[PDB]
Amino acid sequence: ELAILKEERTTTPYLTKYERARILGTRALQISMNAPVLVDIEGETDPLQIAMKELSQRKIPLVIRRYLPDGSYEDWGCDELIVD
Amino acid sequence: LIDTAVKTAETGYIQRRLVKALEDIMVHYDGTTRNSLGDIIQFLYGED
């Protein structure tokens, strides 16, 4: 109903700056509060740096839910979104 | 000197009014420019 099926998704597939920032902050928080890390850490002890690297590898388990003006939403995966 | 002193406050007031007027307009995903209620002012921001 408010959801829209993945076959007919119409929103842009690039990841907007706001989505980037929100995902980075959310993940870095989670990372910084005992959340598992989906990629390797070598020298970047900074949780924000860990989040940046993990996004660069497209290994972040978060789904964006964008709200259409009407009220309907669609579900994009951080995996599928084309990160520039 | 007098001219500068007068002009500054008036410019501040006008800027305040404008900012208050448009403060709610944002760009949704559909590419249309709507205020809070959902009115559509531009269907494609700036026409591009």
Next chain:
Amino acid sequence: EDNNRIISRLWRSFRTVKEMAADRGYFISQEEMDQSLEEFRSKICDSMGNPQRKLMSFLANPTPEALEKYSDLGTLWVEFCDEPSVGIKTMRNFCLRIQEKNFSTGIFIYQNNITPSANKMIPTVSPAIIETFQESDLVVNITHHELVPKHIRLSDGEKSQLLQRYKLKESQLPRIQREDPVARYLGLKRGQVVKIIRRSETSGRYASYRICL
């Protein structure tokens, strides 16, 4: 002289009205919009040169393309007011003539004004719909001024699909006053949606929708 300029103005107004009727979807004979000034003089202006307003009324009918596109585009009657001023009796008899002739749409043109009492009973001829236009207001066609863009009405299917596209509500769209001069010229009615395409210096052709009030 004064009469000559008066006749020229009357002819220009008549041309405006004819073009308006053409635009809304109603056919006219092609040469008629091409009607020259002096043939207008002979056709209407008296021996002394005085015009004959009753000699101006006429009829028009929907073009089949517009007729099928717009379902309700019914017979249109036009008429000029003989009286320089308008009273209740004139509008009463005009409404009766419209009703008897059974024209879904009628247009009245005065010269000076309409008494407010007469204006009051204007919307009292439903479902037949009536309108008025001052003569001077029709000297120059506005849709042919540089700034004005070209409005286009939509069909029920077109407007419905448009609203389905954005997932909207009829109120959510930009609104154009039904008393907007262009709205009158196009005989706009509540709930209709007219699309305006505009010369945009960032994409050239920006298509703008509007709803009427």
Next chain:
Amino acid sequence: LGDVELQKELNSEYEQLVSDRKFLREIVFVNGDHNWPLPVNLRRIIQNAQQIFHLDRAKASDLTIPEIIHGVRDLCKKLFVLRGENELIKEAQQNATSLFQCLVRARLATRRILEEFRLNRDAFEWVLGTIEAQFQRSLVHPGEMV
């Protein structure tokens, strides 16, 4: 020299440009001012391609006109602004990129490419990919309190 199947493609593209010039010159810009803000600068992309492949000298181009016009025509339909299969969506897409597509064609004309730029095949491919990506990043994002 003297061929026709190429002459028809060239004629089609030239007529497209003639129509574009008429449209712009008679509708958009009445006075004649041809300087305006538009997205994704081109001259820079052209000269970056030139440098990246050392495109000076009079070395003959090894690029077929049909490939050039095929890419250009294909490109004009790839500039995504609204993504969806409704007719109105497609009409809006067309309306948005009108002047940008006009600019693109004004630049990447076969004569222009082959003489003033003398690109090669891979150079042209890179130019097209670059224009695509640069435009795609140049969009207003959702949420901007414009």
Next chain:
Amino acid sequence: TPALTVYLDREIALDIEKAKVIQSSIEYTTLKNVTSATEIYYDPDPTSTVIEEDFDTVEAYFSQSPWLLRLELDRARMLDKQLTMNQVADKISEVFSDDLFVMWSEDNADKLIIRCRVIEEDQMLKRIEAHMLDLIALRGIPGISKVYMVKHKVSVPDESGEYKNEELWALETDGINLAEVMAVPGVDSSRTYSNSFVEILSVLGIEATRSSLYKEILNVIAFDGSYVNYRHMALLVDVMTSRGYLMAITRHGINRADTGALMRCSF
């Protein structure tokens, strides 16, 4: 600053003399301008006058209450506006028919005098004199104090396809009357523009209002030499007229919007 920019006909735009004629036509010179003096002479005898300024002229022209309303005119004004005194008499005739007999001198007479005879009345004569000095319009659209024979330069395409300058005459005015002027013959009625976008809304609808508003804002900002991205000013105007009427940016228009109360309250 009410001002109009009136485009002349292509023929007249390059024609200086026809531009002058058209301007003279539009210019709203009323009888108040032309009048030079107004004196009430009590002429007991309707058949003649006891005043030497026009005694010979009125007597030669000849072949009720006796109060006479006698007014003088300035030759320079009539000749400069190109309208002759007999036309003034005629116009007085149409406006007031026959309540005042209009006896008119000749241009060869040094003082151009139009005589009015009435048909307690002494005050009524002065009242007629006042109403006359004011409520008679000779020529020109109402509301046009003055008009300017502004010259213009415009880019024009040429035969070869180039764009070439072309000097064209034009009329600028002080005073705004949009609907009436377009119907004045000798003027391009498809382009004429006014500086008061309110009249644009009144006459040429809303979209023309949008465009005129944007043009005015752009001119105001850019006059110094600055520049602003067009999209911003476009957003401003298109918000200003989203509902269809000028949502003037103040407490009234903003608050008169039917948005949430918390919004309009804070402002």
